Amino acid sequence: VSLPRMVYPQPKVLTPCRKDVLVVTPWLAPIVWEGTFNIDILNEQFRLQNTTIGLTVFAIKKYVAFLKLFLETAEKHFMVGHRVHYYVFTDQPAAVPRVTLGTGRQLSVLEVGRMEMISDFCERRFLSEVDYLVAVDVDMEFRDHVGVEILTPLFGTLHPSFYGSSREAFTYERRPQSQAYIPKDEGDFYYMGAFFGGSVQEVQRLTRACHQAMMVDQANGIEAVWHDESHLNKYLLRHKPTKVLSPEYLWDQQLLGWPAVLRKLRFTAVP
Amino acid sequence: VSLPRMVYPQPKVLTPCRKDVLVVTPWLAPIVWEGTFNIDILNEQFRLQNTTIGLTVFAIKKYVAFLKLFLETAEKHFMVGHRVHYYVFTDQPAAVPRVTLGTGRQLSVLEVGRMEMISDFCERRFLSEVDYLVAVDVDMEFRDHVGVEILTPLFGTLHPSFYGSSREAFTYERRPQSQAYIPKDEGDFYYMGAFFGGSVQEVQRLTRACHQAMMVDQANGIEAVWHDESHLNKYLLRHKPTKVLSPEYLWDQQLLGWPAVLRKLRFTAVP
Ligand SMILES: [Hg+2]
Ligand SMILES: [Hg+2]
Ligand SMILES: [Hg+2]
Ligand SMILES: [Hg+2]
Ligand SMILES: [Hg+2]
Ligand SMILES: [Hg+2]
């Protein structure tokens, strides 16, 4: 379906987008930084498709306390204008705060007794209800725009502690006995487990692969150094993401401040 | 399907890819320049899918003379290592040169009595035989690598005469009576009609849209200033390409020399 007439600044072929950061991977996936995208064009493209975005979040034991701020700030900043379906996985349904949602946005509480829950228990439901799935940690708040610029078949996010690091310095799983093993001469980026996503199909593929690999590891009596993040990094090494999010999308201002390369701090650790 | 272990230079997050050119559009489509891609990674990705690329070329009347050089150089430079199916549309089947083809590459001669031929007469055949379709002009030669880095649902190529030009200077159709009309405050880039493509489905959509728009124009007694290039530009304005090729992919060295921004001259006008 065709875009309408739109008036915006002409793109400049002979002006680099950013001169301080890498804005495309070697497999031609965009790295999403402020300045790289026109949100009006992207909003049009995804609205024309009636895009629904599922956000999955696990809130277990004491973590239920982070829900009110997480959801309230998501309402202000996450996919505003688009259909959103929050999926809150919790051991305490009654402790889920009653947060007021904007039109076209809904929340489902799913009681638990992450990779098995997305791939196994919820597969049919997600294919039916949403176009994209995003998995994030609950102990976080949105502080600025997180929108459809992220949407793509499969994305990972640059871990804020490692985005300038050498691949040798990445905390990948280094034991050859683990399915998550990555040697010191391999690796593109260190992706944080706290923010990944993509189409429902690609996210189920990923969570199925991870879950199967983790069970192998367990049967072999080994546990990856950083658990499902270790597995996520292996998967994204072998199945390149179609977009990568800059650390604007997963930051910790207390730990890391507000450096020059970040024009916006969008989604952050709660102290 | 998973990529194998591969050893290559780590991508550098804090080093821009190019500081002289734009490498991503405002809708987050890569602009393909030398330096932006690792061809080994891309080759792996597309080979794992057993990708077949159809190349369509029209050679009418005196233009049959350009076929031998066009095909011989395509053999050296175009999608080497991948399955290729050339579709030569001609009024002179017997004048098509017998060019020796590498393994996995085939050529079909299709006799004619471009947009109607791709969309109308050939739709079923292409869906059956190829994954991607590329449409180029015959009076050209390959001089360097043109590979799977181009492949994407839908791509256009920067016209070599206009890549540094203001949108006002673009030779778009400017009469509101034409379906191809673009006003002076609209337009991202000027795309050349001589090199476009994408998935079979997206290329058929485009050629169907163009053909229908050209028939409207004709019934209205108007002909766009640059014919199907005018229509191509309108379509790509309203349906943003998922990759854009730099002028490396469509150059004229006689006319335009070999400027600093071009690290490679891949596909060029024959003098
Ligand atoms: Hg930019
Ligand atoms: Hg995995
Ligand atoms: Hg994982
Ligand atoms: Hg680069
Ligand atoms: Hg068109
Ligand atoms: Hg066209």
Elucidated via = X-ray
Ligand 1 centre distance from Cα of residue A147 (Å): 17
Residue-wise DSSP of B126-153: HHHH-SEEEEEESSEEE-S-B-GGG-SS
Distance CA B84, CA A253 (A): 52
- List all residues 6 or more positions away from B49 whose beta carbon is below 8 Å from its beta carbon: B1, B131
Distance CA A170, CA A185 (A): 11
In angstroms, this model's resolution equals: 1.8
Tell me whether residue B159 is annotated as binding: yes
Tell me whether residue A40 is annotated as binding: no
Residue A166: how many CA atoms within 13 Å on its side-chain side?
A: 5
Q: Which residue shows structure tokens 């791939």? A: A119
The answer to whether A96 and A90 are in contact (CB under 8 A) is yes
Residue of B22, B26, B32 with shortest CB distance to A37:
B26
Candidates B1, B12, B28, B186, partner chain A, best to mutate (most A CBs within 10 A) = B28
Categorise residue A30: left if φ over 0, alpha if ψ from -120 to 50, beta otherwise: beta
Ligand 1 centre distance from Cα of residue A263 (Å): 13
Rg (alpha carbons) of chain A, rounded to whole number: 19
Test B186 with A2 for CB contact under 8 angstroms.
no
Residue of B26, B38, B186 with shortest CB distance to A5:
B186
What phi and psi, each to the nearest 5 degrees, are found at residue B168? -55, -35
Element containing residue B82 per DSSP (H, E): none
Kindly compute the dihedral angle of the four CA atoms of residues A191, A193, A197, A202, in this order, to the nearest 10 degrees: 90
Residue of A23, A37, A187 with shortest CB distance to B17:
A23
Domains and CATH numbers, chain B: 1-271 (3.90.550.10)
DSSP-assigned letter for residue B117: I
Tell me whether residue A120 is annotated as binding: no
3-state secondary structure chain A: CCCCCCCCCCCCCCCCCCCCCCCECCCCCEEECCCCCCHHHHHHHHHHCCCEEEEEEEECHHHHHHHHHHHHHHHHHECCCCEEEEEEEECCHHHCCCCCCCCCEEEEEEECCCHHHHHHHCHHHHHHHCCEEEEEECCEEECCCECHHHCCCEEEEECCCCCCCCHHHCCCCCCCCCCCCCCCCCCCCCECCCEEEEEHHHHHHHHHHHHHHHHHHHHCCCCCCCCHHHHHHHHHHHCCCCEEECHHHCECHHHHCCCCCCCCCCEEECC
Smallest CA-to-CA distance from B149 within B16, B9, B39 is with: B39
User: How many angstroms separate the Cα of A254 from the Cα of each of A93, A165, B14, B206?
Assistant: 31, 20, 22, 50
The answer to whether B30 and B240 are in contact (CB under 8 A) is no
Ligand 1 centre distance from Cα of residue B28 (Å): 10
What does the angle CA B228 – CA B233 – CA B239 come to, to the nearest 5 degrees?
Answer: 120
Identity of residue B145: H
Element containing residue B237 per DSSP (H, E): helix B228-238
From the CB of residue B116, how many other CB atoms can be counted at a distance below 10 Å? 15
Tell me whether residue B90 is annotated as binding: no
User: How many angstroms separate the Cα of B83 from the Cα of each of A119, B78, B79, B243?
Assistant: 35, 10, 8, 21
Distance from CA of B160 to the nearest CA of A (A): 12
Smallest CA-to-CA distance from A234 within A87, A115, A122, A153 is with: A115
Catalytic residues of B: 229
Test A186 with B158 for CB contact under 8 angstroms.
no
Ligand 6 centre distance from Cα of residue A164 (Å): 44
Categorise residue B71: left if φ over 0, alpha if ψ from -120 to 50, beta otherwise: alpha
Distance CA B105, CA A195 (A): 43
Residue A34: closest C-alpha in chain B: B26
Distance CA B105, CA B53 (A): 9
Residues of chain A contacting residue B208, judged by C-beta atoms under 8 Å apart: none
Distance CA A41, CA A33 (A): 16
Rg (alpha carbons) of chain B, rounded to whole number: 19
Candidates A28, A172, A192, A231, partner chain B, best to mutate (most B CBs within 10 A) = A28
Distance from CA of A224 to the nearest CA of B (A): 19
How many helical (H) and strand (E) elements, i.e. helices and strands, does chain B have? 7, 10
Residues of chain A contacting residue B21, judged by C-beta atoms under 8 Å apart: 13-14, 16
DSSP-assigned letter for residue B5: P
Candidates B13, B34, B245, partner chain A, best to mutate (most A CBs within 10 A) = B13
Residue B1: closest C-alpha in chain A: A239
Give me the catalytic one of A75, A149, A202, A229: A229
Distance CA B91, CA A135 (A): 57
Largest CA-CA distance found in chain B, in angstroms, rounded: 60
For chain B, the straight-line distance linking the first and the last C-alpha, in angstroms and rounded, comes to 44
Residue B162: closest C-alpha in chain A: A13
Pairing of strands B195-199, B132-137: antiparallel
Length of chain B: 271
Give the long-range contacts of residues B114-120, CB within 8 A, separation 24 or more. B114/B58, B114/B89, B114/B207, B114/B228, B115/B207, B115/B210, B115/B211, B115/B214, B115/B228, B115/B231, B116/B207, B116/B211, B117/B58, B117/B89, B118/B56, B118/B203, B118/B204, B118/B207, B119/B204, B119/B207, B119/B208, B119/B210, B119/B211, B120/B211
Distance CA A258, CA A271 (A): 15
Test A27 with B37 for CB contact under 8 angstroms.
yes
Element containing residue B182 per DSSP (H, E): none
The answer to whether A237 and A187 are in contact (CB under 8 A) is yes
In sequence order, the β-bridge partners of residue B55 are B86, B134
Distance CA B40, CA B4 (A): 11
Residue B167: closest C-alpha in chain A: A10
Tell me whether residue B59 is annotated as binding: yes
B219: its two tokens: 């019934």
Ligand 2 centre distance from Cα of residue A212 (Å): 8
Q: In chain B, after which residues does the backbone break, taking C–N over 2.5 angstroms as a break?
A: 113
Residue of B21, B38, B187 with shortest CB distance to A13:
B21
DSSP-assigned letter for residue B77: H
Smallest CA-to-CA distance from B205 within B126, B137, B108 is with: B126
What phi and psi, each to the nearest 5 degrees, are found at residue A107? -130, 130
What does the angle CA A46 – CA A49 – CA A55 come to, to the nearest 5 degrees?
Answer: 60
What phi and psi, each to the nearest 5 degrees, are found at residue B201? -55, -50
Largest CA-CA distance found in chain A, in angstroms, rounded: 60
